[PDB]
């Protein structure tokens, strides 16, 4: 035995292309649409819960994931690849930051760590690149609210608003017309629901849509009282009912 | 064809070509004969020279006072395998105060050769061995193939033109097995056996190599004028 | 591609057989063993006249009682020589004696088949190992990248080997003197070399019991070349 | 075309070795089904013993992973037993480290993660199996979680796997469309097993003897398999109404 | 194509062709069988006499694991020896930690997982043997057969090698004609007959019969080789049935 | 076994070229153009972001210009993720040197170290090379203001003015035409922006498509200041130099 | 070994080191030079456990010479002293620490200033106008505290050094067999052959 | 605390003649004040006309003789059955002993 | 770890990776070495395809390994740095253990050994570099000049050239260099070295570098103007 594949499986072709990265991006293109919008007082990330079977309980499959109390993530592409990256991202937030500085990492630096892991799967021996693009929304004291995209190559970019996957080209055009620097969080959620309806074929309700926000601190979700400086997580996943209430004012 | 690039690949008919190619190296090697009675076991080997200025390549290697072998094929591989046998004979004597049984020595050689046929990166051994010995159950003769197959026999031969000697031993079976307490006559039978594999060349004084082990006889190799008596 | 340790359908190792082809392209080396000593000679073969030929080192001392000549990819010989020197000195440290010429040769040949996927390929050089010990007297061995070594009364390796070996077949007898062997190596080197043989493009050496291994001066070899010319003109 | 031999991306962003591992999953020609009751989780699987020289008691694709968790496998038996041994080791280690029994959904995620690694690392091949884990979880109640060679997993109200999975799936879908609830509204596990066998008979269009089926039942604090005689009693009750 | 050039590669069928090629080596080997009796198991194998120079009764093929398990195999003999060596290590470690000798089903999975592991990587070759093995433990007699894929099941009777079809048919008759069961001494006689009958697929050369058994009443649950008078009696019974 | 799937990333061609290095250089030729110009009183770094969007958050964005320490900065052309791996290693090397000798690392020693790391990936390990070319802008008290470049081969060279990425042939000719030795920073700022304005593949050069930085002794007295320009500051210098 | 002294004057650094080597009962040598030139304008004197002193000094010398060749540049005295401190700080938590104390006297050609650094085996570094190791400071510092001026000439420094050695020869129990004195300035390193 | 060493007593004597040599030893083996054996051979024929005795801690003594006898065997294997001369044997035993310099064979050896 | 045998024999007995490394040397800028009676001169070609170069800071072609030995090269620039670093480390290690600086032959033998090692080690490719190593042995006034190549073979030369168009300049040296009477002065040796490069270089401007090494660690690099004076005098004698 032993892993005898100690050589790169991603290499430059004569034209300068890294084939395996391009092919990973193609897998992302086939994936279900997900989006993110930044407001003045918050950020929203959303996607469709494309259930593989009606016998499947789609609530047990989480496409939008908490990374830290103030940072959340959504994806387009290969689900299993996303799941393991969420595990690695949650751990690296502790091992390379919280166990050193006693606080959770700022959004941009956690994004940087996830990006590094994805870069290494593009150069290290005997592995293929990750077949996902990530959208990571978060808040921290000194940088405020932010939204980032991470691609299979390991490259990342900050956005005011964006979309990835299936209908990203049309969705990004829709977002360009609606976005301004004076949007409140409720306005951004409204625009997110409007944008997501265009790429969804079948049912469009709280049970088929997954949506989460980075907004105000939630002391009700902290689990304890007594420490004034601890005010609760800014990440909150909207319920099925909360989504449906905003679909009547749609 | 498409399945002979390495030892880790079966062919569509379930063959291992790298092992078969290693077997072919033995067939190119010089002839060597093995035979035994109930009291003694004998090795006879035709040594091969490079040219008239060169020496004749040695064929017989001593492994212990009671055990040794003759080779046909890649000589450095015989050195590796005979070194391993020397170590195993030695381990048995040092740890257990026990002379290593010839049959157990065959089992150890089989297993060592097998590992080189199932893993990537390695290669099979390119040599065949005839092991003789005298232990607690009497005289023994073994034939080793680098496929891993080890066989106990009354007599045999390996190398080029070995089929002639093997047929002779198959005829003489009932005679040479009865040559008890007479080392010279058992060697005569072995020298007559290896003669059935000669063409154009004959057995000379620096050509012939003989080894014997028995009841009250340590494994000893005869070369030079010591084999003129049998020419 | 294919394994570095792969057997051919004929039962030969591809890489070993290919390294033997590299040795055929090497400069000629010759050895002759007598009861008075063993002689070693080489063709230097400088690629340009501006190359200082006394820096070409194809005959090398392993110990006082063992010398060595090389042919083929001569850079590959350096680690082989290093191992041989270490083995000779180590045995003297462990046993307070000279190592047997055969035992030294066997130790060098143990390196040969240590390649795979250890070094990445076989050695591309052949060695003539000459020496003396008390048990077997004056000896000459031919060490190959296959791991095999043969003892020889006389032997030639390199590009002019088969023509030289045929010549050695006719000339060698068991009563040769050291002087007769020296002239014989010079005669056969002169026969197979491209350029005209002189003291600057050829080198002689010997091993005797009394004086040990010695590389001959260019002045000493020049005299033996002049002695050779005169005796060939003598009939 | 070595992108088809190892787990690297094809120009379409596909992993062919994963897709071919899904095909190996149906090599045994066996169908399985899982449903949830009020207090239990039932799994049934076809049993085929084609050789008379076989000992039929040793032919099985249902595994007792832990006291609480059962696993049925769709795929060849060598890969099935590989996954079974690993799941047993993971469940035991979890209990030792964290002081409580490994939940069904957590084991499924763990085995799904291991499968994901085989799709990303070249030296390891995917296992040609689909794994359906069942239990009555102490927090979530009756639970069905299924894993595949892509490293995907999800919870199910009910599920089916095998060559004829679609027929069984649609049959189950239609029943839950009528009842409008996420489970079989029945008190006893015996009747939930009877429901499971009945709906497999309806969907496949075949009758079963006691030796044609294999049944696993999960209740609070234990998973167990039924004997041939226990299955016979189930078949008799189905025929008598 | 090219899917069959490397181990552990799935073909578009979902097949591992290298494992299927290992089966071809097994089918090329000599015939070996196993019979599960009332309180134990019997193993028998065909040994081809390639030459008169082979010493009779010396080249033993059946192998013992621990003191209660017998193993026989068809195909590449060295591969079988490698598998038995691993089996002996597995049995030793089990007994070291748990005191009791390894149960037969437990031992079956140890061999199974090891053989299956040699189908996971391209850096190793699958085993070129099918192994019939078993013995007696605390729950009674058990007989197993293990394939190159790692696949194994329990058996009433088992056969592999060149004459496996002939042998299987003979075994199926015994299962039908004896639902109550077969005695250990009967199983030895029947094993001799089946090997003699299966030798028709290898009729060119003559052969040597080798039998072993583990029985609660006959061998105290230990693996033993059938020798001398009991072996000759089985040879006579076999020779009588073919004539 | 595994040999079958090995691309052999570290072999010579029959012409004596390194396949993967050559192909990595081809990749870099499609990246946004980066320019460095060295003057007597400072250094300018100017670089073009690749086809952007109106929804990209520019003021928090960085893809071209990176700080290695207070005295040394780099401009990137190629794979951004590959660059960040090397940048972090360079930042560590600089701090290792500062801890060991209690002096800031000389510019060339940092450049040689990163270049040796790139070289290793071309000779051993069987891995793909880094698809990155750097322009190093830095100051030390031995050689003063210095410009270097390195590429995937691990080769590095010093420059008065240099470009990497797209359209380097056109850019280098324009720089060679207008550069003079007695030039000052304010003049070099203009040259860099004018050169990008002519070589760009975009329709017009605007503030949102640029990253800009200066290294000046325009720091109060005997010290050096790095200035990573803000979006509004890039907009102002574009108006000042008369491009918008 | 025993006594090593240092003094930084206006334009140079002067290092004085004893000549005796004692192995228990006997004085084996009376002409030992306890110093190594690290670079043309940097000198290091040393004292501590036998063997480790010369081993450490030659190791440092080899490293600074390597840096000089690689960069074609002489490191500043400050940079050399920092490198030496780190090596000793690393060594103190090793399996077997270097038991070596050093003085580093260098002339900085950039700043045109002499510099004297005192570093003990723990890696404790200080820059001083004058320094010592062991018991040497106990006898000499009261004299240096009185007479020292930052604008002293090299000759005045040597005279103050003579007074220090005379006090050592009077009150110290051990015979250290005099001192070898070396001067480090803009022109490099030279030995005072009559002291 | 465990003491890896012991003392088995015994006395040995080697004398070299003009054309001969003798190595003698008593046959008594002891611990403290007890006799373990009245006849436990202590001087051994090691082959190649060499006799050896390693007196002191008998476990170390037996181990050393065993390893030297083994060295003679492998000298024959490695060097074409060459006779191991007494001077060569002596140098070889030095290396066997110094190999355990920091955990010594607690014996006094004579050949 | 990556263990792949990249350097292997072919059916005709050639190691192609080593031979292709020589092709990289053929592409590199020309380097030349000439030893006089009491000196050695190393000349190097600078390709003028790169202007706007900062010549103060750009890596120079001749590198000091120690105060008494220098190394120049033709081939891959990045590869040469690895050999130069290893040689510099070994030079200091030799001084530390032997208490004597390396001989020119020893330093050559070491660098050549490193090159050979990279031709039969797994997972590595050969150096695309040939070197000229020149200097004087400690306390010796006899000039030394050696050459190494990717295969690892090395030898001593009265005069030698490597790199692109080295066939042409070797032609010049073979007819212009007399062994019985080598360039007796520094002037004569530098003149013969500049002459040899002018057969190949183009403009005698910033395209020719010259470094002179004399006994007892006396090494100096000539400036543009000093070389320009040799370039001027050579052509004024040629106009005849
Ligand atoms: Cl996990």
């Amino acid at each position: 035995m032993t892993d005898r594949y100690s050589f790169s499986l991603t290499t430059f072709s004569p034209s300068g292309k890294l084939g395996q990265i391009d092919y990973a991006l193609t897998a992302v293109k086939q994936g279900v649409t997900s989006l993110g919008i930044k407001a003045t007082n918050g950020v929203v990330i959303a996607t469709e819960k494309k259930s593989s079977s009606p016998l499947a309980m789609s609530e047990t499959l989480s496409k939008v994931s908490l990374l830290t109390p103030d940072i959340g993530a959504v994806y387009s592409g290969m689900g299993p690849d996303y799941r393991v990256l969420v595990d690695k991202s949650r751990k690296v937030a502790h091992t390379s930051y919280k166990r050193i500085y006693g606080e959770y990492p700022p959004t941009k630096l956690l994004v940087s760590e996830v990006a590094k892991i994805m870069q290494e799967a593009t150069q290290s021996g005997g592995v293929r690149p990750f077949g996902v693009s990530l959208l990571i929304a978060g808040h921290d004291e000194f940088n405020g609210f932010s939204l980032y995209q991470v691609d299979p190559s390991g490259s990342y970019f900050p956005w005011k608003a964006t979309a990835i996957g299936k209908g990203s080209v049309a969705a990004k055009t829709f977002l360009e017309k609606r976005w301004n620097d004076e949007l409140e969080l409720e306005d951004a959620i409204h625009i997110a629901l409007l944008t997501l309806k265009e790429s969804v074929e079948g049912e469009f309700n709280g049970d088929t849509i997954e949506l989460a926000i980075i907004g105000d601190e939630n002391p009700d979700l902290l689990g304890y009282t007594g420490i004034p400086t601890d005010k609760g997580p800014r990440f909150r996943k909207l319920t099925s009912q909360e989504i449906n209430d905003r679909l009547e004012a749609l | 064809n498409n399945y002979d690039g390495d030892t880790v690949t079966f062919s569509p008919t379930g063959r291992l070509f790298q092992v078969e190619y290693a077997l072919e190296a033995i067939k190119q090697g010089s002839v060597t004969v093995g035979l035994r009675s109930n009291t003694h076991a004998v090795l006879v080997a035709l040594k091969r020279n490079a040219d008239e200025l060169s020496s004749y390549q040695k064929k017989i290697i001593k492994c212990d006072e009671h055990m040794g072998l003759s080779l046909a094929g890649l000589a450095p591989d015989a050195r590796v395998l005979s070194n391993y046998l020397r170590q195993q004979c030695n381990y048995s004597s040092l740890v257990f105060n026990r002379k290593l049984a010839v049959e157990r020595a065959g089992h150890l050689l089989c297993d060592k050769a097998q590992k080189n046929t199932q893993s990537y990166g390695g290669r099979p051994y390119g040599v065949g061995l005839l092991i003789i010995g005298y232990d607690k159950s009497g005289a023994h003769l073994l034939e080793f193939q680098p496929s891993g197959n080890v066989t106990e026999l009354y007599g045999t031969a390996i190398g080029a033109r070995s089929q002639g000697a093997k047929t002779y031993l198959e005829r003489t079976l009932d005679t040479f097995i009865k040559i008890d307490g007479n080392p010279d006559e058992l060697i005569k039978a072995g020298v007559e056996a290896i003669s059935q594999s000669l063409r154009d060349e004959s057995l000379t004084v620096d050509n012939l190599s003989i080894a014997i082990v028995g009841k009250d006889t340590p494994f000893t190799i005869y070369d030079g004028e010591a084999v003129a008596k049998y020419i | 591609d294919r394994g570095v340790s792969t057997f051919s359908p004929e039962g030969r190792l591809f890489q070993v057989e290919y390294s033997l082809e590299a040795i055929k392209l090497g400069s000629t080396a010759i050895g002759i063993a007598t009861k008075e000593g063993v002689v070693l000679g080489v063709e230097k073969r400088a690629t340009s006249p501006l190359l200082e030929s006394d820096s070409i080192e194809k005959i090398v001392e392993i110990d006082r009682h063992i010398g060595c000549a090389m042919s083929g990819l001569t850079a590959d010989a350096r680690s082989m020589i290093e191992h041989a020197r270490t083995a000779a000195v180590t045995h003297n440290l462990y046993y307070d004696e000279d190592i047997n010429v055969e035992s030294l040769t066997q130790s060098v040949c143990d390196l040969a088949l240590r390649f795979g996927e250890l070094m990445s390929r076989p050695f591309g050089v052949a060695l003539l190992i000459a020496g003396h010990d008390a048990d077997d007297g004056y000896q000459l061995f031919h060490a190959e990248p296959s791991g095999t070594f043969y003892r020889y009364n006389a032997k030639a390796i390199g590009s002019g080997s088969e023509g030289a070996q045929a010549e050695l077949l006719n000339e060698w007898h068991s009563s040769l003197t050291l002087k007769e062997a020296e002239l014989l190596v010079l005669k056969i080197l002169k026969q197979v070399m491209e350029e005209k043989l002189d003291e600057n493009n050829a080198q002689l050496s010997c091993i005797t019991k009394q004086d040990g291994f010695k590389i001959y001066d260019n002045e000493k070899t020049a005299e033996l070349i002049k002695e050779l010319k005169e005796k060939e003109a003598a009939e | 075309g070595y992108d088809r031999h190892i787990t690297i991306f094809s120009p379409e962003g596909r992993l062919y070795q994963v897709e071919y591992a899904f095909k190996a999953t149906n090599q045994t020609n066996i169908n399985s089904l899982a449903v949830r009751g009020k207090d239990c989780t039932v799994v049934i699987s076809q049993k085929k013993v084609p050789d008379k020289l076989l000992d039929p008691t040793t032919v099985s694709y249902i595994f007792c992973i832990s006291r609480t968790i059962g696993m049925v496998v769709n795929g060849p038996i060598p890969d099935a037993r590989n996954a079974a041994l690993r799941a047993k080791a993971e469940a035991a280690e979890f209990r030792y480290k964290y002081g409580y029994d490994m939940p069904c959904d957590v084991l499924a995620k763990r085995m799904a993660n291991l499968s994901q690694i085989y799709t990303q690392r070249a030296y390891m091949r995917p296992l040609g199996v689909i794994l359906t884990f069942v239990s009555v979880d102490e927090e979530l109640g009756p639970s069905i979680y299924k894993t595949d060679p892509a490293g995907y997993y999800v919870g199910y109200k009910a599920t089916a796997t095998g060559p004829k999975q679609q027929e069984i799936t649609t049959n189950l879908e239609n029943h839950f469309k009528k009842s409008k609830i996420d489970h079989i509204n029945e008190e006893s596990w015996e009747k939930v097993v009877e429901f499971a066998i009945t709906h497999m008979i309806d969907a496949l269009g075949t009758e079963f003897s006691k030796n044609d089926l294999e049944v696993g039942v999960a209740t609070k604090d234990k998973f167990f398999t039924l004997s041939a005689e226990n299955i016979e009693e189930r078949l008799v009750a189905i025929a008598e109404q | 194509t090219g899917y069959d050039l490397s181990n552990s590669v799935f073909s578009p069928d979902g097949r591992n062709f290298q494992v299927e090629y290992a089966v071809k080596a097994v089918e090329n080997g000599t015939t070996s069988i196993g019979i599960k009796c009332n309180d134990g198991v019997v193993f028998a194998v065909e040994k081809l006499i390639t030459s008169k120079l082979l010493v009779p009764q010396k080249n033993v093929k059946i192998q013992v694991v621990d003191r209660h398990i017998g193993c026989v195999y068809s195909g590449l003999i060295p591969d079988g020896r490698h598998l038995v060596n691993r089996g002996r290590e597995e049995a030793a470690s089990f007994k070291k930690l748990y005191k009791t000798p390894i149960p037969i089903p437990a031992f079956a999975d140890r061999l199974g997982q090891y053989v299956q592991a040699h189908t996971l990587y391209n850096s190793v070759r699958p085993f070129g043997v099918s192994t019939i093995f078993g013995g007696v433990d605390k729950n009674g007699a058990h007989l197993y057969m293990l394939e190159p894929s790692g696949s194994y099941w329990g058996y009433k009777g088992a056969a592999t090698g060149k004459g496996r079809q002939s042998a299987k048919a003979e075994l199926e008759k015994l299962v039908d004609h004896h639902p109550e069961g077969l005695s250990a001494r009967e199983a030895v006689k029947q094993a001799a007959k089946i090997i003699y009958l299966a030798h028709e697929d290898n009729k060119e050369k003559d052969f040597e019969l080798e039998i072993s058994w583990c029985s609660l009443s006959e061998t105290n649950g230990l693996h033993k080789f059938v020798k001398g008078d009991l072996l000759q009696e089985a040879i006579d019974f076999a020779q009588k049935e073919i004539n | 076994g595994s040999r079958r799937y090995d691309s052999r990333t570290t072999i010579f061609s029959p012409e004596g070229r390194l396949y993967q290095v050559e192909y990595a250089l081809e990749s870099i030729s499609h990246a946004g153009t980066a320019i460095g110009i060295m003057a007597s009183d400072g250094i300018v770094l100017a670089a073009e972001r690749k086809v952007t969007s109106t929804l990209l958050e520019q003021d928090t964005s960085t893809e071209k210009l990176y700080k290695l320490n207070d005295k040394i900065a780099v401009a990137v052309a190629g794979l951004t993720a590959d660059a960040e791996i090397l940048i972090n290693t360079a930042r560590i090397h600089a701090q290792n040197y500062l801890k060991t000798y209690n002096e800031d690392i000389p510019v060339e020693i940092l450049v040689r170290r990163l270049s040796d790391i790139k070289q290793g990936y071309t000779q051993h390990g069987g891995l793909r090379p880094f698809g990155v070319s750097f322009i190093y802008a830095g100051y030390d008290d031995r050689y003063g203001y210095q410009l270097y470049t390195s590429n995937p081969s691990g080769n590095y060279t010093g420059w008065k003015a240099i470009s990497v990425g797209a359209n380097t042939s056109a850019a280098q000719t324009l720089l060679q035409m207008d550069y003079k030795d007695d030039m000052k920073v304010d003049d070099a700022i203009e040259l860099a922006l004018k050169t990008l304005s002519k070589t760009t593949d975009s329709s017009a050069l605007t503030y949102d498509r640029l990253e800009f930085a200066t290294i000046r002794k325009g720091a109060n007295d005997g010290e050096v200041y790095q200035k990573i320009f803000k979006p509004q500051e890039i907009k102002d210098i574009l108006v000042k130099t008369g491009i918008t | 070994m025993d006594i090593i002294l240092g003094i930084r004057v206006q334009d140079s650094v002067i290092l004085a080191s004893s000549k005796a080597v004692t192995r228990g009962i006997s004085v084996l040598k009376d002409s030992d030079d306890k110093t190594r030139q690290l670079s043309p304008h940097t000198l290091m004197s040393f004292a501590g456990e036998a063997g480790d002193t010369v081993q450490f000094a030659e190791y440092i010398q080899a490293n600074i010479q390597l840096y000089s060749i690689r960069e074609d540049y002489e490191l500043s005295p400050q940079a050399v002293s920092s490198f030496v401190r780190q090596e000793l700080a690393k060594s103190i938590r090793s399996r077997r620490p270097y038991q070596v104390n050093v003085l580093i006297g260098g002339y900085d050609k950039k700043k045109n200033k002499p510099e004297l650094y005192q570093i003990d085996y723990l890696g404790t570094k200080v820059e001083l106008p004058y320094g010592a190791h062991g018991y040497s400071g106990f006898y000499t510092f009261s004299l240096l505290d009185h007479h020292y001026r930052p604008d002293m000439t090299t000759e005045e420094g040597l005279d103050l050094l003579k007074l220090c050695v005379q006090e050592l020869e009077k009150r110290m129990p051990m015979d250290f067999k005099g001192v070898i004195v070396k001067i480090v300035d803009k022109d490099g390193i030279r030995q005072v052959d009559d002291f | 605390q465990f003491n890896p060493y012991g003392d088995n007593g015994g006395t040995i004597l080697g004398i070299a003649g003009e054309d001969f040599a003798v190595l003698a030893g008593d046959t008594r083996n002891i611990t403290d004040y007890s006799i373990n054996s009245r006849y436990e051979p202590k001087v051994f024929d090691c082959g190649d006309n060499i006799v050896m005795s390693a007196n002191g801690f008998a476990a170390d003594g037996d181990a050393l003789v065993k390893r030297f006898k083994n060295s003679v065997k492998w000298y024959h294997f490695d060097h074409n059955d060459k006779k191991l001369s007494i001077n060569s044997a002596a140098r070889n035993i030095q290396h066997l002993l110094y190999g355990k310099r920091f955990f010594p064979y607690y014996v006094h050896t004579i050949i | 770890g990556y263990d792949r045998a990249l350097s292997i024999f072919s059916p005709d007995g050639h190691i192609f990776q080593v031979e292709y490394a020589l092709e990289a040397v053929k592409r590199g800028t020309c380097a030349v070495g000439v030893k006089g009676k009491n000196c050695v001169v190393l000349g190097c070609e600078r390709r003028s395809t790169l202007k706007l170069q900062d010549t103060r800071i750009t890596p120079s072609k001749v590198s000091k390994i120690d105060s008494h030995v220098v190394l120049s090269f033709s081939g891959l620039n990045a590869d040469s740095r690895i050999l130069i670093e290893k040689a510099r480390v070994e030079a200091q290690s030799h001084r530390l253990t032997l208490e004597d600086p390396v001989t020119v032959e020893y330093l050559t033998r070491y660098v050549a050994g490193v090159q050979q090692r990279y031709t039969q080690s797994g997972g590595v490719r050969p150096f695309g570099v040939s070197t000229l190593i020149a200097g004087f042995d400690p306390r010796d006034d006899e000039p030394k000049l050696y050459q190494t190549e990717p295969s690892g073979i090395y030898s001593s030369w009265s005069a030698q050239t490597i790199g692109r168009n080295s066939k042409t300049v070797r032609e010049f040296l073979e007819k212009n260099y007399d062994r019985k009477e080598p360039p007796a002065t520094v002037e004569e040796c530098v003149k013969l070295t500049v002459r040899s490069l002018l057969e190949v270089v183009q403009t005698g401007a910033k395209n020719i570098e010259i470094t002179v090494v004399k006994p007892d660690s006396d090494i100096v690099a000539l400036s543009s103007e000093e070389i320009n004076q040799y370039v001027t005098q050579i052509e004024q004698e040629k106009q005849e």
Side-chain angles (χ1 to χ4, degrees), chain I residues 180-197:
Chain I
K180 271 92 82 272
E181 208 157 66
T185 59
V186 178
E187 261 211 334
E188 290 178 37
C189 198
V190 173
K191 194 188 178 190
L192 185 62
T193 308
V194 174
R195 274 176 65 198
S196 66
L197 280 165

Side-chain angles (χ1 to χ4, degrees), chain I residues 191 194-195 198 203-205 208 224-240:
Chain I
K191 194 188 178 190
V194 174
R195 274 176 65 198
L198 285 171
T203 319
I208 292 169
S224 302
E225 295 93 315
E226 297 168 52
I227 297 159
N228 202 25
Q229 288 163 44
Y230 280 95
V231 175
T232 308
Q233 194 191 100
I234 286 160
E235 283 159 319
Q236 288 182 3
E237 292 172 42
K238 202 171 182 223
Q239 294 171 33
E240 260 141 334

Side-chain angles (χ1 to χ4, degrees), chain E residues 66-79:
Chain E
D66 199 286
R67 282 135 96 150
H68 68 297
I69 300 167
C71 295
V72 70
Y73 41 79
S74 300
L76 304 178
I77 303 304
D79 281 17

Side-chain angles (χ1 to χ4, degrees), chain B residues 46 52 56 161 194-204 207:
Chain B
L46 180 72
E52 271 53 54
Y56 287 78
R161 278 157 269 174
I194 200 161
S195 292
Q196 311 303 318
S197 298
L198 308 169
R199 297 212 315 264
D200 299 51
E201 202 189 359
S202 59
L203 308 166
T204 78
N207 202 4

Side-chain angles (χ1 to χ4, degrees), chain F residues 97 99-100 102-103 112 142, chain G residues 67 71 76 82-83 86:
Chain F
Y97 189 99
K99 163 148 177 58
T100 300
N102 229 63
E103 291 179 342
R112 194 201 297 120
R142 187 186 173 178
Chain G
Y67 190 103
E71 309 301 332
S76 69
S82 292
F83 174 80
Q86 187 177 65

Side-chain angles (χ1 to χ4, degrees), chain F residues 3 6 10 12 15 115-116 119 122-126 143 154-155 158 160, chain I residues 2 4 6 17 27 52 54 56 58 77-79 81-82 123-125 127:
Chain F
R3 152 171 49 252
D6 183 15
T10 65
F12 286 107
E15 292 75 46
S115 298
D116 289 343
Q119 192 282 150
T122 76
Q123 189 157 216
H124 54 82
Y143 290 114
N155 178 224
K160 289 164 175 165
Chain I
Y2 186 68
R4 236 262 212 185
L6 304 174
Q17 283 298 122
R27 179 174 286 93
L52 252 46
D54 191 342
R56 313 171 302 145
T58 288
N77 284 199
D79 281 22
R81 289 203 311 272
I82 278 64
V124 303
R125 61 158 182 83
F127 290 93

